[PDB]
Design an enzyme around this catalytic site. Structure first.
Site, mmCIF file in Angstrom:
data_model
loop_
_atom_site.group_PDB
_atom_site.id
_atom_site.type_symbol
_atom_site.label_atom_id
_atom_site.label_comp_id
_atom_site.label_asym_id
_atom_site.label_seq_id
_atom_site.Cartn_x
_atom_site.Cartn_y
_atom_site.Cartn_z
ATOM 1 C CG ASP A 342 -2.004 1.137 1.056
ATOM 2 O OD1 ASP A 342 -2.173 1.691 -0.056
ATOM 3 O OD2 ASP A 342 -2.655 1.460 2.070
ATOM 4 C CD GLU A 368 -6.208 -1.549 -0.900
ATOM 5 O OE1 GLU A 368 -6.817 -1.620 0.186
ATOM 6 O OE2 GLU A 368 -6.648 -2.047 -1.958
HETATM 7 C C1 LIG Z 1 -2.657 5.992 13.433
HETATM 8 C C2 LIG Z 1 -4.012 5.652 13.051
HETATM 9 O O1 LIG Z 1 -4.386 4.278 13.660
HETATM 10 C C3 LIG Z 1 -5.762 3.840 13.331
HETATM 11 O O2 LIG Z 1 -5.826 3.603 11.930
HETATM 12 C C4 LIG Z 1 -5.744 2.175 11.550
HETATM 13 C C5 LIG Z 1 -6.828 1.900 10.600
HETATM 14 O O3 LIG Z 1 -8.094 2.080 11.311
HETATM 15 C C6 LIG Z 1 -6.795 0.529 10.089
HETATM 16 O O4 LIG Z 1 -7.893 0.436 9.125
HETATM 17 C C7 LIG Z 1 -5.519 0.154 9.428
HETATM 18 O O5 LIG Z 1 -5.483 0.771 8.126
HETATM 19 C C8 LIG Z 1 -4.579 0.134 7.227
HETATM 20 C C9 LIG Z 1 -5.342 -0.829 6.370
HETATM 21 O O6 LIG Z 1 -5.910 -1.819 7.221
HETATM 22 C C10 LIG Z 1 -4.488 -1.536 5.383
HETATM 23 O O7 LIG Z 1 -5.346 -2.216 4.427
HETATM 24 C C11 LIG Z 1 -3.390 -0.685 4.699
HETATM 25 O O8 LIG Z 1 -3.740 -0.187 3.486
HETATM 26 O O9 LIG Z 1 -2.876 0.463 5.532
HETATM 27 C C12 LIG Z 1 -3.930 1.143 6.276
HETATM 28 C C13 LIG Z 1 -3.376 2.391 6.952
HETATM 29 O O10 LIG Z 1 -2.044 2.215 7.229
HETATM 30 O O11 LIG Z 1 -4.317 0.570 10.146
HETATM 31 C C14 LIG Z 1 -4.345 1.897 10.953
HETATM 32 C C15 LIG Z 1 -3.488 1.732 12.051
HETATM 33 O O12 LIG Z 1 -2.257 1.338 11.563
HETATM 34 C C16 LIG Z 1 -6.780 4.864 13.679
HETATM 35 O O13 LIG Z 1 -8.100 4.413 13.190
HETATM 36 C C17 LIG Z 1 -6.436 6.161 13.087
HETATM 37 O O14 LIG Z 1 -7.566 7.061 13.397
HETATM 38 C C18 LIG Z 1 -5.091 6.637 13.581
HETATM 39 N N1 LIG Z 1 -4.755 8.084 13.186
HETATM 40 C C19 LIG Z 1 -4.586 9.010 14.375
HETATM 41 C C20 LIG Z 1 -3.112 9.379 14.545
HETATM 42 C C21 LIG Z 1 -2.783 10.906 14.649
HETATM 43 C C22 LIG Z 1 -1.285 11.126 14.416
HETATM 44 O O15 LIG Z 1 -0.555 10.198 15.148
HETATM 45 C C23 LIG Z 1 -3.483 11.807 13.626
HETATM 46 O O16 LIG Z 1 -2.596 12.022 12.531
HETATM 47 C C24 LIG Z 1 -4.794 11.214 13.114
HETATM 48 O O17 LIG Z 1 -5.646 12.282 12.762
HETATM 49 C C25 LIG Z 1 -5.442 10.278 14.172
HETATM 50 O O18 LIG Z 1 -6.737 9.901 13.780
#
Ligand SMILES: C[C@H]1O[C@H](O[C@H]2[C@H](O)[C@@H](O)[C@@H](O[C@H]3[C@H](O)[C@@H](O)[C@@H](O)O[C@@H]3CO)O[C@@H]2CO)[C@H](O)[C@@H](O)[C@@H]1N[C@H]1C=C(CO)[C@@H](O)[C@H](O)[C@H]1O
Ligand code: C2E
Ligand code: C2E
Ligand SMILES: C[C@H]1O[C@H](O[C@H]2[C@H](O)[C@@H](O)[C@@H](O[C@H]3[C@H](O)[C@@H](O)[C@@H](O)O[C@@H]3CO)O[C@@H]2CO)[C@H](O)[C@@H](O)[C@@H]1N[C@H]1C=C(CO)[C@@H](O)[C@H](O)[C@H]1O
Lengths: 678, 693
Positions: A342, A368
């Site tokens: 990805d 992806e």
């Molecule tokens: C840091 C981030 O963690 C959480 O996000 C997770 C996703 O919910 C998951 O769906 C998963 O996404 C991955 C897919 O499964 C995969 O198919 C591939 O394509 O990569 C995707 C993304 O890498 O993995 C994520 C965790 O690794 C959480 O839901 C999310 O809201 C979090 N973001 C927060 C972090 C801070 C900075 O540290 C801000 O930038 C954001 O606004 C926060 O919302």
């Protein structure tokens, strides 16, 4: 203590039998100290004085596998310039072949003081971080052979290393949820009997348990937070974390290859566990921040194109070299067979390096695209349009037939003009993202309140139908309709042109309670329950077998159509060939496809012609019973081989013989396949 | 019998049972593999299976020695830059062996001679070169890549044919060939000279330009490449149907056994197909817009300062071809490094940094390519692309500023001593700030471009009329002085001075920090009769005449030996200078410290350099201190006798070890010992070196 100048290459810690070469890149560094950790918490520090094209290096005689080490970079701390060097932080070797320990969250692992984001923090991080370990590279592969299963024989099974075997009753407790558990003959047996040819593993690169998740009582289950691109995640190893995890992973690959199964790794090169400017300082931020990460207009901050904190600098030569060194390492030294990427002008050199590299360009390269249909012609892609369209067919979205026909036949509208084959299309009904197959016929809307983000995480448009009740039900009518719906999805997938991917546990009806985004649920929500689920298992194995035994379902060319021999034809349920008008009829939700097993033009491996039986694929996705007419001569007979209306599984149950012109009644939301030998 | 086969690797791969064929083209509608028979006839086979625009088939029973070629059916539309023409038998760009020679006529052109935008339907097969399937087998034995570090490297640039065409110890069959290169007399000459790397002028298969052939000339140097994977067949005594590969490998195996590396001059920036009026041999007919940087009117080719065309360096299959070529020559031909010329002329809007970024990315990350010697020729000083000092820090470079400065000093040009001190000590102003070592500067006074050493002291101006371009080719500003007469002389005084001047250049090269490069035949004082650009002279103008114990050879061998025996002349760090031991010091001939006034005075033509052998800070390979004797280098670049005082304490003795004014050669002759404070006079245009333990 002896220190020799050594080599700038290869990067990392290379053990030669009498000593270890250390080599680490930084163009921001003023001085680089290699710190040798001892088991008693003390350090011996030695400068890497020799520098070549900004790679500092030294060879240390007598340093042996199992030695824990790190790097201290003395260099500017000027965040307004993007420089975040801080010598109080023991940095992870980006090339570390094995990583030991875990992050203990506190002030020490951060590079800034705990009031001000742009000042400097002086506590020593060494006792609270993971540490790199020198590895002995030796492993006896014996007769290991890469399966090299071509794509038109491929069935991908996406699985999570821990969840696949965490509850398997045949395994000893300390193998459960581990790399070694993957090597267990019971697990390998189940994958073999499912017809699986490629095990895609959710991320196995060493990742970090997010401070955010740890503080909330959760953990990073899926692992999309890599810190070590060369090390297998140590929490999935039961043999230990000082190199033993390398041995474990290699023996899992070796056992899978002995069974003829390819290993595909999900690899996450787009970001790292160091997060945004408020994240920790663990490896690259302290080594050379402007060389590794894409910085915002204000260099204090990080471009975050993915939601994951940061973004690797894809134009930077040592980012490109690290990614390639990592891919080559996992192929050549870990014997994996491909990768799922990805990468959420900037990718141009990356694509150039992949295409020409003689090791990487020859493994399976799956992308992806989120970019659907726009990866270079050597990439295969996850086909989310396939997923959304098949999900729309069986939930009754009312103008799906025309697009469903394309998705069923390899999505030519997406790949043919690029010069690809239908095999570029990795079709799937579910994966780790979103509903499991059973949750998809049981929930209209996602239930992620245990993830701690207010149900704001995860996909909002699941294209799902709960079959009449949200959640678990006593109704036998709903229960049976759900069971057929699951069969509809599984059969549609195994009869479609392209490359099918299955989601681990779907063959058992795995549920996550309607949690469509379980990245942080390392518990019974996600783990495979090993075993009604015997009808689903029997049905899936036989559907995979039907595909394996009939080449017309897995062709190497797109269907030709009618030439102005006909290889494919479309009919109304009443048995008349379909006109252009027929494709737009509002309540057109039913269709017969004829696949001509006498019209496969692709030669086999030695130029031989490929022949097969012919098929009639009868889809009723209306909410009513429909009579179909077998379009053919009254004297030709067809054997019913699939009927998803059968509550006991057809297949493996076999069906009646049908004459052409004879009427057959299909239940609402049902699929039947017929098999005239021609 | 035709099987689908595989799309990888590109080219003809023989497995023992038959041969896989894979060729790239995005523009082709159909591709025909043609299999030529010794009677001219052809068996055509479609390459039907296509994958990411690589068409491929496997043919069981097809064997090494098989002549083949490609015919591309596809659009001929020069307005759109498409020049596919199935009447042309195209070369496999990956051909491991190219047989034959271009027979110049209309049939080898894609257009008819009256109308550049029309299609020429003549069959080209009887007039072109053909690709040959080769058996990759070769028993290398104990072969080891010497992997000589840069601070031990002495490069010797040579032409394969010219080096041995006139060598009396070689049977005539081997003179001027790859087999010749492996003769023990040739290898033995290089070993005794001190050469550690043999840099060969272009050996990639190339084409004899039509404009040269229709003038009585030919392409002798070979900067006109058609086959990037095949050794040039005209340099092979053994034949051109696969044997040229075996002969090249023999040469490399023999040179490695003597501990000598092979460096290849490689020309990837353009091909022999030239501009839109050149022939259609390989890539123009395969996929023209994929291979060549086209002008805004796609009929026409961007070029690289007057070579005709320019490879598209951002094209993924151009990059794959170059990397595959590099990897092939290293992994299978066992060569040790490459000298690149990546020059091009880009339109204003585009920049060299974006043209070569992927290329440099590829080279730096590749495990095989990035670990061999990587030497670049920079853009020349005016037309700035990548100028000297600008290549990325993994690369070493031909330092043309070293050449110019050392020529100016021994010419007596006005204010040279300042720049000279810098070039003598590794060109810190070009290489220190970008993080490089003094080992990044390949130093040289002559090379194949310009005058030979002997001609550099024998002519003020070039004489290139025989080359057929009205004296317009080659450099105009040679920074040469004929020592008092243009051309050959029988004057004993001018002959003594020419001999001393040639020892001045060689001694200056061998005492300078950096990596020295010698131009073949300068050890015998080879002359080109003042031709300073002998690219088209495949004759006695260019070939080496071998002697039948000359002073120059003896002086050169011993100067190379002096450098090899003393690490202070080949350091891995730039001189620290004064702050604090003092590792280098600069003195007037009268023996006092150079001030900032002395470097800029008109009269400043003479220097004493002190090199401190107890001041080498960089460790050896096992972390031990490197120690060496200390040296005084006294340069009299003035045109009068000059008195020098030894800048030392009153009771320390020095050994004279170099004096270029001794006509029998010193070294190897041994001079007297002098004490600090003594006055010694140096001849005009002379160099004296003193050694103290
Ligand atoms: C840091 C981030 O963690 C959480 O996000 C997770 C996703 O919910 C998951 O769906 C998963 O996404 C991955 C897919 O499964 C995969 O198919 C591939 O394509 O990569 C995707 C993304 O890498 O993995 C994520 C965790 O690794 C959480 O839901 C999310 O809201 C979090 N973001 C927060 C972090 C801070 C900075 O540290 C801000 O930038 C954001 O606004 C926060 O919302
Ligand atoms: N590519 C490469 N080039 C090298 C290396 N060592 C020296 N050079 C060059 O040699 C010059 C003088 O090195 P020095 O005598 O040690 O004199 C140096 C040294 O005493 C010290 N210095 C520079 N870097 C370091 C370092 O990383 N560690 C230590 N302990 N001292 C350093 O400051 C002096 C001046 O430093 P510079 O401006 O950098 O100028 C350096 C530098 O351009 C090397 O290992 N790799
Ligand atoms: N003799 C010959 N005929 C050619 C060639 N290219 C196209 N055609 C012929 O013209 C039909 C339409 O080709 P298409 O647009 O490429 O539509 C093609 C094309 O998209 C696809 N595809 C077919 N063969 C290949 C292949 O070898 N490699 C790749 N990447 N895709 C292929 O299958 C679809 C249907 O192809 P067909 O059933 O075979 O029917 C093809 C074929 O009969 C060729 O190189 N040689
Ligand atoms: C085609 C071209 O041939 C002649 O050019 C040769 C040079 O004179 C040689 O000095 C030599 O240059 C190479 C250097 O030796 C080498 O160090 C490396 O850097 O590459 C250099 C260039 O490749 O080799 C050249 C020939 O192989 C001739 O002097 C020159 O005028 C010729 N250019 C003509 C060709 C036509 C198109 O076909 C026009 O574009 C030009 O205006 C013509 O002048």
């Amino acid at each position: 203590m002896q220190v020799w100048p050594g080599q700038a290459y290869p990067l990392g810690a290379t053990y030669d039998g009498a000593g270890t070469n250390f080599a680490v890149f930084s163009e921001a560094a003023h001085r680089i100290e290699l710190c040798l950790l001892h088991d008693d918490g003390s350090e011996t520090a030695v400068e890497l004085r020799e520098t070549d094209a900004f790679v500092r290096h030294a060879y240390l005689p007598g340093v042996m596998p199992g030695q824990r080490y790190g790097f201290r970079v003395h260099g500017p701390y000027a965040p307004e310039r993007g420089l975040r060097c801080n010598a109080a932080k023991l940095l992870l070797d980006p090339y570390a072949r094995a990583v030991s320990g875990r992050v203990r969250w506190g002030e020490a692992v951060y590079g800034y003081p705990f009031g001000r984001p742009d000042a400097r923090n002086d506590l020593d991080s060494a006792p609270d971080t993971m540490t790199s370990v020198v590895v002995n590279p030796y492993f006896d592969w014996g007769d290991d052979r890469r399966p090299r299963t071509e794509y038109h024989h491929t069935v991908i099974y996406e699985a999570h290393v821990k969840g696949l075997t965490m509850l398997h009753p045949d395994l000893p407790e300390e193998l459960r949820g581990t790399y070694a558990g993957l090597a267990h003959p019971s697990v390998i047996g189940h994958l073999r009997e499912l017809g699986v040819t490629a095990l895609e593993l959710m991320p196995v690169h060493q990742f970090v348990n997010d401070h955010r998740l740890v503080d909330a009582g959760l953990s990073n289950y899926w692992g999309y937070n890599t810190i070590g691109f060369f090390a297998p995640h140590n929490a999935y190893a039961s043999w230990g974390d000082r190199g033993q995890q390398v041995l474990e992973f290699k023996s899992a690959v070796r056992a899978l290859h002995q069974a003829g199964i390819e290993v595909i790794l999900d690899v996450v090169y787009n970001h790292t566990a160091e997060g945004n400017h408020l994240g920790p300082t663990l490896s690259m931020r302290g080594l050379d921040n402007p060389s590794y990460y894409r910085l915002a207009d204000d260099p204090r901050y990080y471009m975050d194109t993915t939601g994951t904190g940061n973004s690797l600098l894809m134009r930077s030569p040592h980012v490109l070299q690290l990614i390639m060194d990592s891919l080559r390492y996992w192929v050549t030294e870990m014997h994996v067979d491909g990768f799922r990427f990805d990468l959420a002008d900037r990718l141009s050199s990356f694509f150039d390096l992949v295409q020409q590299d003689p090791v990487v360009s020859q493994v399976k390269l799956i992308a992806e695209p989120w970019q659907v249909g726009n990866f270079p012609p050597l990439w295969t892609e996850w086909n989310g349009k396939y997923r959304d369209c098949v999900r729309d067919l069986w939930r009754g979205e009312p103008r799906t037939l025309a697009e469903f026909a394309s998705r069923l036949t390899g999505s030519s509208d997406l790949y043919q003009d690029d010069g690809r084959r239908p095999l570029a299309s990795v079709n799937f009904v579910t994966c780790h993202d979103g509903f499991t197959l059973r949750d998809l016929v049981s929930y209209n809307e996602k239930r992620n309140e245990a993830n701690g983000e207010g149900n704001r995480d995860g996909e909002n448009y699941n294209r799902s139908w709960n079959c009449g009740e949200e959640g678990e039900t006593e109704d036998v009518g709903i229960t049976e309709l759900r069971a057929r719906q699951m069969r509809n999805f599984l059969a549609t997938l195994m009869l479609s042109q392209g490359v099918p991917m299955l989601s681990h546990g779907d063959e058992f009806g795995r549920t996550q309670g309607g949690n469509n985004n379980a990245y942080c649920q390392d518990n019974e929500v996600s783990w495979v329950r090993w075993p009604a689920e015997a009808t689903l298992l029997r049905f899936t194995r036989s559907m995979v077998r039907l595909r394996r035994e009939h080449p017309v379902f897995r062709r190497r060319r797109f269907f030709h159509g009618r030439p102005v021999l006909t290889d494919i034809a479309w009919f109304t349920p009443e048995g008349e060939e379909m006109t252009s008008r027929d494709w737009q009829a509002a309540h057109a939700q039913a269709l017969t496809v004829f696949l001509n097993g006498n019209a496969i033009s692709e030669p086999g491996t030695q130029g031989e012609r490929i022949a097969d039986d012919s098929f009639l694929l009868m889809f009723n996705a209306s909410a009513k019973e429909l009579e179909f007419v077998v379009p053919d001569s009254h004297g030709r007979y067809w054997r019913m081989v699939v009927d998803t209306s059968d509550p006991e599984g057809m297949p493996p149950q076999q069906g009646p013989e049908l004459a052409g012109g004879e009427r057959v009644t299909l239940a609402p939301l049902s699929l039947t396949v017929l098999r005239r030998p021609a």
